[PDB]
């Protein structure tokens, strides 16, 4: 049926294994070595040509097959290098994997465009980005390359379109003494594998989870998407507070901002339809990005929690 | 990246759709070479910046009818090593050292044709529209009935019957509805060989003999196909040391390490009364070279009056920092703000070793230091005197 039957498989917890698509490459020894001291179940990992070797005293296999009925893996992470990333995340779909973490910024947006086309026909595998940050489980599960330190196990979902400023938004709410649930970074490319509306249906189903941060930023219109589904199942009695910080009100138009899908084009994408869309949804919007975690708390004071 | 007007030209002409014939002239004395060429009377001057604007010798407007190659001469002599402006340039513009001497046409109908990567229909998309030479934007807000989408599949390409539907929808006479949809699927073939993320042609018109033609051609690229795309990307030094940097028209320097959080630095900079100087992403993998060559961009602009630095991790990025102040010899305020490994020894690092640099621990703290810094600066530059600063421990 719909490829929405696997947004289940966003909420990685303490039972996720997972390999390393491009185990032998700097980014994916790396990163790793640090999933391992972070204490996730990082089994092993795929390298052509290398398969049978031992890398960091794990298993390496030729194919991502090969690696998920050898260590039953139910997640895959992904540092091949854009020329290849999209295949990558091809072979990880071809293999039935439940989520995948593409890490890779660069990949070609016609090669994304390929991806989209087959993920979208299809049920078994999630994908998670590319240019993303990944998703992390606070405490239990961590895909990709957030730093863990400044995460602590709370009550606030984060998904975000950004890297570092999700790191911002996540120090602010430990700062605070909140914590998070689930932090899920959707990457800034115009063709991703997972949307806000996506993790807000998984935000808005957890017990875990009393209050979300949307971080968006310009282009496209996945904002507005959020918006009207908030306004739909997240209205009237017992609902969870939405707190958001859009970035690009000071971008120039039609100029990429780092960022493959920051951008305004034909006069869509502009940060304020953005933030006046959420507003109209009940949103906070916070106008400053250093007053996220502070904003969510009296947010969450004005309703005794 | 985008090429001049010409440059996409060229690209429609060898995959054979047809393109107003015109020659590219970068001085004055060649424009009348190129209009004596075309007949010496009706002939369009077309600037090429990388179009309804002004430019600096006092002319509007980039593409003007001149009759005479004496005129042609004359009016790309207020061109050619000119700079034009306009909104999207800022208080700057763009250098003009080229213009294309094209022949003049004229057309019976415009209408308006685009393929382009569409977020809603994830993939491309055929654009069309019987209202075609003016802005799309208004169009679409005006009646969008007119605008005729039509999305493809991109494992089974474009079909002849779709290019055939969308230009009878958009108003094509029968007798040439097969050679329009021609050129649109010749564009749909430019459009994936060359990683073009939109191809718009505006208008896309009735010749006077009755033919399609494609009068002016936008074409934006992927640059994350670079690799891929060697043809393309051989036609300031941000791009040289490989830093996503953008110049802007604020007085303050905005130095950080991801794309969303230095956006969220330019408008938490508006937010407290500044205006941001240039966008930056710094990124991970971030070496000495990077900082240095990202503070000796942001000081080669004089109107920065501070320099903000916002990046989120601490001691080895600053001695980074330290190293670059020390050798470009700046002068103007620098407030950074550290998040990660070593916050305090990289805060006692700046302070206890000479420059004066101010740390922040707080973004919105970070954020007024900066702007107030530099109005301290602009009322100093106003008053004639000159200020140096003496900072906290």
Known sequence: MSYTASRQHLYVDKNTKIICQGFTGKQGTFHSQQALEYGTKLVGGTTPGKGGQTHLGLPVFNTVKEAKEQTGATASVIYVPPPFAAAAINEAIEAEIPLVVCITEGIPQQDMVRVKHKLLRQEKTRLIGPNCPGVINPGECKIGIMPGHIHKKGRIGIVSRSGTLTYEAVHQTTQVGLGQSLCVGIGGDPFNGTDFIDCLEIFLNDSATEGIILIGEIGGNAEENAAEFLKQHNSGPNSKPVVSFIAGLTAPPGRRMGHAGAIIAGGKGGAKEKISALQSAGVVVSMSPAQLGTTIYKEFEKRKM | ?393
Do not use: W
């Open chain 2, 1 to 393: 990246l985008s090429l001049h007007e010409y440059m996409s030209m060229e690209l429609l002409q060898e995959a054979g759709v047809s393109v107003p014939k015109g020659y590219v002239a970068k001085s004055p004395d060649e424009a009348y070479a190129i209009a004596k060429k075309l007949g010496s009377k009706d002939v369009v001057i077309k600037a090429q910046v990388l179009g309804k604007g002004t430019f600096e010798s006092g002319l509007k407007g980039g593409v003007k009818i001149v009759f005479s190659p004496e005129e042609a001469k004359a009016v790309s002599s207020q061109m050619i090593g000119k700079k034009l402006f306009t909104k999207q340039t800022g208080e700057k513009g763009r250098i003009c050292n080229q213009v294309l001497v094209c022949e003049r046409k004229y057309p019976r109908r415009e209408y308006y044709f685009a393929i382009t990567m569409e977020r809603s229909f994830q993939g491309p998309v055929l654009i069309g529209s019987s209202h075609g030479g003016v802005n799309i934007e208004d169009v679409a807000a005006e009646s969008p009935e007119a605008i005729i989408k039509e999305p493809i599949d991109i494992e089974e390409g474009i079909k002849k019957e779709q290019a055939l539907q969308l230009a009878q929808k958009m108003g094509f006479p029968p007798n040439i509805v097969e050679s329009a949809a021609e050129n649109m699927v010749k564009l749909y073939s430019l459009f994936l060989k060359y990683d073009a993320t939109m191809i718009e042609i505006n208008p896309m018109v009735e010749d006077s003999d009755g033919a399609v033609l494609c009068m002016d051609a936008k074409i934006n690229f992927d640059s994350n196909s670079a690799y891929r795309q060697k043809k393309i990307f051989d036609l300031k030094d941000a791009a040289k040391a490989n830093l996503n940097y953008i110049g802007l028209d604020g007085n303050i320097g905005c130095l950080v390490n991801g794309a969303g959080l230095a956006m969220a630095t330019m408008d938490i900079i508006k937010l407290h009364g500044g205006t941001p100087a240039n966008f930056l992403d710094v990124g991970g993998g971030a070496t000495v070279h990077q900082v240095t060559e990202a503070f000796k961009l942001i000081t080669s602009d004089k109107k920065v009056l501070a320099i903000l630095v916002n990046i989120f991790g601490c001691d080895v990025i600053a001695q980074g920092i330290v190293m670059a102040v020390k050798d470009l010899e700046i002068k103007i305020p620098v407030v950074v703000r550290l998040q990660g490994t070593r916050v305090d020894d990289a805060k006692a690092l700046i302070a206890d070793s000479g420059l004066k640099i101010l740390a922040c621990d707080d973004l919105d703290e970070a954020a007024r230091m900066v702007v107030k810094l530099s109005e301290i600066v602009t009322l100093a530059k106003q008053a004639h005197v000159d200020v140096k600063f003496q900072l906290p421990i």
